[PDB]
């Protein structure tokens with residue numbers, strides 16, 4: 001949520017910034033500001049974020065690598081996965097329903113190897129601490145990171161357990177951002193212990209409400225996908241620099257795997273609810289002849305910290321202030337598997353195993 | 369479910385075998401447990417289970433033994449209070465080197481079963497539909513043991529899902545409705561998944577630590593085999609789970625469960641129990657079961673001889689190799705040192721970047 005003092009003493013400045021991201025603040029209602037409307041207001045954009053309406057106004061910052069030229073017919077990841085009996089979408093319908101998958105054999109092992117390579121890289125070289133977290137969370141946690149009240153329909157919710165004294169309303173996590181960031185809920189942190197850098201590998205569950213029609217086949221858009229998440233808790237004055245550092249950590253994954261990509265900064269109209277600034281990384285997908293989002297890295301400013309009342313304290317004076325939080329994908333594992341399968345395919349239908357993954361796959365050089 | 373021909377032609381024989389496991393046989397067919405195998409000892413509860421063998425000797429300590437919760441807290445590696453804040457009781461947050469050892473355990477097990485024991489690795493959904501739960505027997509009788517999700521408003525009729533209590537459920541259902549060539553058997557599958565259990569009627573049982581949780585990781589083994597091979601396959605599969613404990617240098621004992629302590633769907637179960645120093649006893653770390661044709665009948669999973677065209681029901685088997693949270697308990701307590709550090713078992717060091725000690 002936003003600083004209530006800014007809504008008091010500068011309703012004009014605030015309503016204008018929010019207008020740049022397409023949100024009209026009822027000034028009349030703004031004075032009143034009752035109920036939970038304060039919890040439905042998105043974060044203020046940083047000054048340097050380009051103004052725009054939708055994704056067509058996003059701005060490319062840089063890119064790395066050149067898409068490979070194919071002298072044979074380019075096959076998509078579903079065709080490749082099914083001809084090696086490694087992806088089975090029909091079995092997933094039988095077990096559960098649509099937008100789930102079963103992976104088998106060498107392709108399942110490559111999916112596992114990707115998550116292990118990412119986790120090792122961030123913990124051994126980038127200074128992140130590894131965490132194993134619950135995949136179910138409670139209402140206070142979802143309010144803390146902003147998923148509630150506005151995005152309840154994006155989540156899977158559990159029913160109450162048939163028991164005496166059980167009244168648990170849990171939701172499945174849509175991203176490890178939720179549990180990791182809430183680890184500092186209600187804490188007051190010594191400024192000398194900052195930054196806190198955490199990573200986790202979790203499944204992620206999303207209803208994908210109102211996304212039907214788009215990406216109907218394949219691994220791009222699923223109800224369940226694996227993701228290695230990075231989160232940082234930092235001093236307010238360090239957060240813009242930490243965003244550059246964290247985005248670089250995600251780029252390093254793509255570079256070591258040899259995947260061409262581009263980095264874009266989102267405009268005001270395309271940013272997510274809680275971010276004040278976001279870089280997306282988009283990886284080359286040969287069969288779609290374009291770049292597709294593979295990571296989103298955001299500075300959240302003090303927006304989550306205020307809901308969570310997570311504060312830091314200086315060593316000189318005992319005064320406290322809100323920390324800043326950041327999160328970013330490093331990376332979404334399912335979409336990385338898509339990019340590896342299509343970019344490393346060979347003319348005979350085999351898939352070359354990227355060099356850095358071979359130690360995680362018992363030396364295997366080719367799939368198939 | 370049981371063979372309906374058998375209930376017709378031999379109600380006496382059937383009602384007697386079911387009596388052994390404490391079930392009085394007067395959609396209702398789906399509430400009847402499996403028939404115990406002849407070699408299973410008759411008994412009422414876990415006091416009548418029978419020890420079969422042991423391997424290794426518990427280590428003798430010349431200092432006071434610390435439990436895994438104390439050890440987890442001194443290394444800032446297990447944090448139960450943070451889990452209550454995020455979610456509720458019976459959850460845990462693991463951090464740092466303890467989290468990495470938990471991950472390394474699952475990778476070592478998966479690599480062993482796929483590289484040496486001939487199992488095929490699978491990534492599966494952690495939500496399943498009701499037909500799948502009926503197939504492996506969790507429905508209709510054990511709905512209360514599960515977390516259920518509310519239907520998605522845009523898939524309102526087809527999204528009554530539940531979180532899996534074990535990868536047995538999705539893996540075994542991969543052959544639902546199939547006819548398999550006998551030459552393609554046995555089918556050997558493994559998976560590493562989280563497991564979710566309501567733990568109803570268990571308030572008080574192991575209230576401290578990692579032994580009993582709402583969420584835990586497990587590496588599961590499943591086999592689909594010809595009906596005449598299933599008792600041999602149980603011995604093979606139980607030995608796959610034993611090899612994990614042996615390579616980790618963990619003392620254990622193997623018991624066979626009596627009729628009265630067996631699970632709903634098993635006809636024969638070996639449990640493996642691992643030595644837990646701070647409890648001065650063995651605790652269950654794996655359960656390996658022959659399920660006979662009980663699940664195959666609900667699923668109509670069949671096999672065909674190449675000679676003729678007749679089909680018959682396959683047999684199915686499942687076993688833990690292993691439950692990862694409880695293995696972490698065993699490794700932490702059996703390898704602790706006097707200063708509180710924890711020796712990393714030799715076989716895990718390649719999965720922990722060469723680390724020799726925690727702490």
Ligand SMILES: Nc1ncnc2c1ncn2[C@@H]1O[C@H](COS(=O)(=O)NC(=O)[C@@H](N)CO)[C@@H](O)[C@H]1O
Pocket residue numbers: 174175176177206208219220221222223224225227229293294295296297327328329330332334335
């Ligand atoms: N339904 C989905 N199926 C597969 N992958 C997805 C799905 N939704 C998102 N992703 C992947 O996960 C990444 C992170 O998702 S995000 O919502 O944009 N951002 C977050 O969740 C933040 N916590 C940063 O990780 C996306 O960039 C995309 O690569």
Ligand SMILES: Nc1ncnc2c1ncn2[C@@H]1O[C@H](COS(=O)(=O)NC(=O)[C@@H](N)CO)[C@@H](O)[C@H]1O
Pocket residue numbers: 533534535536565567578579580581582583584586588652653654655656686687688689691693694
């Ligand atoms: N609530 C729990 N918390 C932690 N570990 C558990 C819990 N319940 C069971 N386990 C572990 O998981 C193992 C397998 O559980 S089981 O119900 O007995 N059997 C199965 O699920 C079969 N699919 C074989 O794996 C147990 O032997 C025990 O080691």
Ligand SMILES: [Mg+2]
Pocket residue numbers: 293296
């Ligand atoms: Mg995004």
Ligand SMILES: [Mg+2]
Pocket residue numbers: 652655
């Ligand atoms: Mg049991």
